[PDB]
Design a protein around this nucleic acid. Structure first.
Ligand SMILES: O=c1ccn([C@@H]2O[C@H](COP(=O)(O)OP(=O)(O)OP(=O)(O)O)[C@@H](O)[C@H]2O)c(=O)[nH]1
Lengths: 73, 794, 49
RNA sequence: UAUAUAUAUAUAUAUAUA
RNA sequence: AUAUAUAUAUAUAUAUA
């Protein structure tokens, strides 16, 4: 689509991890998507695998990294 | 040895709400009241004679319980909408008086009065030494009257006449109807108890006592399929997933886990390997036959529009699509994708068979390419099947008060397959003149895998139109046929797995999953009409109470909330203020209309008989005698607002143009302000002679604000200081301004006793299909609407 | 399709400021025509080439 | 006079990428 | 006495008492 009436636009975020728009509004957009998908089906087993993929997003909304230095962690 | 480095993550709470399916919506928990609805309470007040001196006896008077009336004439009407929402949640469904009846402490024989408060009143009058004797004798002969043969009682009460008209209405208007064996069987719909295959049985018979609360199952007064194409999409995708749950699995697929072990230990003994008698094709599985049986039935019972998905280069999926369009009516398949499948049968199978030129079908022609190829074709048997597909329509009939769309009579029979396979045989005996011979051999091999299955395809049509016919008896809401927004993808390579993988085993829906599909279409339809009537009764009571300032988005926001299947925050103000113009035009249900008139008739008797709010002050600029009362002594009160020009202080704050009053307050014209003012009490008499009551209005001229108005209500009596001015000097007290305030009523004990009546015992039962225990006849001999059976083919 | 049922009104503090900036420009535009005419005309009665 | 149908094997390592 | 996540293509290799 490159022509003389067209404009291409390439952007690189400085860091895709650890951006402000990725902590809260990215997890809670996916957890909401698995609430509307828990109503689509009827099994006790397709809901249960979709209540585990929701549980890994609740647990990653707060996280901690374990990096040691010297003798302290 | 650790160290914690924690940072501040900004909190982000998105607008959302929980959405439940139709399978788990809790029914409305029934409300029964514990104490009477009391808004007036007797109180002990001192009494003053005509002189002003305090009398030795006291007197009882009706005052409000928790008299919290907001000031200003608009905030009072906002209180009475709030009172109207308080009587509705306290209004009981069934009210027994044996649960709320406490013992009278002293009577002739030890009887019961109807509440703990009205026993606390009648013992307060007995030990009060100042009471008369004939009031005390009336409490002695105050017992209950019980009648066992009609099981009604008559408990006494002591209620205010406004309080009595609210409790008398709760007793005569109850939602309990009697219940017995011959009315449980009327709860089951007519197309199930008049069905041969299901045999209905019950153990216990209910007594002549037991009652049940019938749900208001009248059709949707909102036409939510008319112009609401975003709310009807989510009220049918909530019904399509419920209907998919109750459509049963095919008997060729499903069996228990241990039967695989039970069939593996004897498979080497009894060699039965080609009993299934089918030619295999690549892309044929049984998990798609079980899938296409459920997305053909559950997309009909909820009226989703299916969308066909296929590839043109599969000559068998297009032949199996010929069975699909001739059973399911073409109004359900979506027009952009029915046409591309209805044209692909023409340009591949029908028109090369006769050697005709393949049709130029432009985009968006108003005639579908079966309706344009019954005119262009010259055969008789394939122009008789193309006439049935062009005129296959649902037949909107109303049955048992529920309009539901039955199929054509030939489709329930199976005779449409004998119209198709009579047409699919003449098309196979043609020559295919233009096309080469291997193209003729590629259809004649594939069109004969479907004509060999006539006995198994004349019976799939019977079974598919019997599972749809049986389950349709269990709906309650009115199914309308309107094309929805989002479609349900039915793969045409999954009808081929249905058409040639079924056989000789009726799957009939068991009656334990018909009673569950019916008890969740009642529990949602009765949770619909009890949210319409709860949200019409506030919209009509907002316009009747003259609330011009209330934005009525909020009382439609919670109407869509209590229907548990809608997400509120993705429904804008456009689809919540159009809905207000529909809920306004509806008549409010009779229990809410008869109780709003019991507020509207005496919303001026609750407002006038309370302290800390006075309905406007009048100004005279002349000495006039203030009238003597018995509970106040000497008070500058005015019972009628007559003879004076009125200013409406609801409007003087609304428009805010104070030019009328501040030109009428400097010239000393007699003015009667009208509103709801908080008044203060100035019991001293030497403030009256100093004319304090006139000096409070001059803060309307310098300062524009009128809400900071406190009119003076004098009270001159014996306990007031400096009272000897009234005693020695022969003068009656004269004021300048008097307060338009009403006198509280007297508590006359013998005129306030009311004999409340109710029944003795109920046993209110929640659902009625727990009693009747149904079971199905053996599916080898299971009978359709014809008395011949289905799955009769060998 | 994003408006609501909540009206906006030019408040009278920013209704008198818009008036006192349209008068103060109109009374400045007319007071500089009267200065520029009274010099052009006075350069002609005085015969100033 | 007649020459069949159908689109995503698995595992580890390696490089390019995110 | 011994640390290297996940996905996407691509190539090399491998299956056996
Ligand atoms: O090994 C990798 C590399 C990349 N990624 C994922 O790819 C994303 C984008 O990878 P980039 O290399 O584009 O990240 P960046 O924007 O931080 O790079 P610079 O501007 O600082 O040069 C990363 O932020 C991470 O999510 C991985 O998951 N694993």
């Amino acid at each position: 689509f490159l022509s003389n009436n067209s404009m291409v636009l390439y952007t690189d975020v400085s860091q895709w991890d650890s951006s402000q728009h990725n902590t809260q509004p990215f997890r809670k957009g996916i957890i909401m998507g698995l609430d509307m998908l828990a109503n689509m089906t009827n099994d006790a087993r397709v809901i249960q695998t979709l209540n585990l993929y929701k549980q890994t997003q609740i647990n990653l909304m707060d996280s901690y990294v374990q990096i040691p230095d010297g003798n302290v962690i | 040895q650790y160290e914690i480095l924690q940072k501040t993550i900004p909190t982000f709470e998105p607008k959302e709400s929980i959405l439940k399916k139709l399978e788990d919506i809790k029914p409305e928990q029934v409300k029964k009241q514990t104490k009477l609805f009391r808004i007036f309470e007797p109180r002990q007040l001192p009494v003053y004679r005509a002189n002003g001196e305090k009398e030795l006896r006291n007197r009882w008077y009706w005052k409000l319980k928790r008299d919290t009336l907001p000031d200003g004439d608009y905030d009072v009407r906002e209180y009475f909408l709030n009172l109207y929402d308080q009587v509705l949640t306290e209004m009981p469904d069934y009210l027994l008086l044996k649960d709320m009846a406490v013992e009278n402490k002293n009577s002739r024989d030890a009887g019961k009065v109807v509440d703990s408060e009205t026993a606390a009143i009648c013992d307060a009058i007995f030990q009060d030494e100042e009471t008369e004797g004939v009031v005390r004798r009336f409490i002695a002969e105050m017992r209950q009257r019980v009648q066992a043969d009609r099981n009604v009682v008559n408990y006494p009460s002591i209620l205010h006449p406004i309080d009595h008209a609210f409790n008398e209405y709760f007793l005569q208007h109850q939602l309990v109807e009697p219940l017995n064996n011959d009315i449980i069987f009327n709860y089951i719909p007519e197309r199930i108890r008049n069905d041969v295959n299901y045999i209905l049985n019950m153990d216990r018979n209910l007594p002549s006592t037991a009652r049940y609360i019938r749900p208001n199952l009248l059709q949707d007064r909102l036409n939510l399929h008319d112009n609401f194409e975003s709310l009807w999409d989510t009220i049918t995708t909530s019904n399509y997933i419920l209907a998919r749950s109750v459509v049963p699995d095919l008997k060729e697929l499903v069996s228990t886990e241990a039967q695989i072990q039970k069939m593996s230990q004897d498979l080497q003994l009894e060699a039965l390997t080609i009993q299934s008698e089918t030619q295999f094709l690549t892309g044929i599985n049984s998990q798609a036959a079980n899938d296409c049986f459920k997305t053909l039935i559950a997309a009909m019972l909820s009226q989703r529009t299916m969308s066909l998905d296929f590839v043109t280069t599969n000559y068998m999926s297009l032949i199996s699509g010929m069975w699909l369009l001739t059973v399911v009516p073409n109004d359900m398949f979506i027009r952009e994708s029915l046409v591309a499948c209805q044209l692909a049968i023409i340009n591949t199978i029908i028109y090369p068979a006769f050697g005709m030129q393949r049709m130029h079908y432009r985009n968006g022609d108003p005639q579908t390419p079966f309706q344009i190829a019954e005119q262009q074709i010259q055969n008789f048997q394939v122009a008789n099947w193309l006439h049935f597909v062009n005129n296959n329509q649902f037949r909107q009939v109303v049955i048992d008060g529920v309009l539901n769309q039955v199929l054509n009579d030939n489709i329930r029979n199976g005779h449409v397959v004998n119209q198709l396979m009579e047409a699919l045989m003449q098309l196979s005996r043609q020559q295919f003149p233009t096309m080469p011979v291997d193209y003729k051999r590629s259809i004649q091999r594939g069109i004969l895998l479907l004509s060999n299955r006539l006995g198994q395809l004349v019976d799939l049509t019977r079974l598919l139109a019997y599972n749809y016919e049986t389950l349709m008896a269990c709906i309650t809401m009115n199914m309308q046929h309107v094309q929805t927004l989002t479609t349900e993808k039915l793969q045409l390579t999954s009808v081929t797995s249905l058409c040639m993988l079924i056989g000789n085993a009726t799957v009939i829906p068991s009656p334990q999953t018909l009673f569950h599909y019916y008890n969740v279409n009642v529990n949602f339809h009765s949770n619909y009409n009890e949210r319409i009537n709860d949200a019409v009764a506030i919209i009509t009571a907002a316009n009747r109470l003259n609330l011009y300032q209330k934005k009525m988005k909020s009382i439609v926001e919670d109407f869509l909330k209590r229907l548990q299947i809608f997400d509120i925050s993705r429904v804008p103000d456009d689809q919540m203020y159009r809905l207000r113009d529909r809920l306004r035009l509806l008549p409010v249900e009779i229990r809410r209309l008869d109780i709003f008139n019991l507020i509207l008739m005496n919303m001026e008797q609750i407002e006038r008989a309370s302290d800390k709010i006075a309905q406007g002050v009048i100004i005279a600029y002349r000495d006039m005698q203030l009238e003597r009362d018995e509970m106040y002594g000497y008070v500058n009160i005015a019972r009628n607002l007559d003879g004076f020009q009125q200013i409406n202080l609801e409007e003087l704050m609304r428009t805010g143009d104070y030019a009328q009053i501040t030109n009428m307050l400097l010239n000393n014209q007699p003015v009667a302000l009208v509103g709801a003012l908080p008044f203060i009490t100035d019991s001293s008499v030497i403030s009256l002679v100093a004319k304090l009551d006139a000096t409070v209005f001059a803060q309307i001229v310098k300062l524009r604000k009128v809400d900071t108005l406190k009119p003076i209500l004098y009270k001159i009596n014996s306990d007031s200081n400096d009272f000897y001015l009234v005693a020695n000097y022969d003068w009656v007290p004269t004021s300048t301004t008097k307060v338009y305030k009403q006198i509280p009523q007297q508590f006359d004990f013998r005129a306030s006793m009311h004999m409340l009546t109710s029944n003795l015992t109920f046993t209110v039962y929640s659902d009625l299909l727990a009693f009747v225990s149904a079971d199905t006849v053996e599916p080898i001999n299971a009978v359709a609407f014809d008395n011949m059976r289905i799955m009769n083919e060998l």
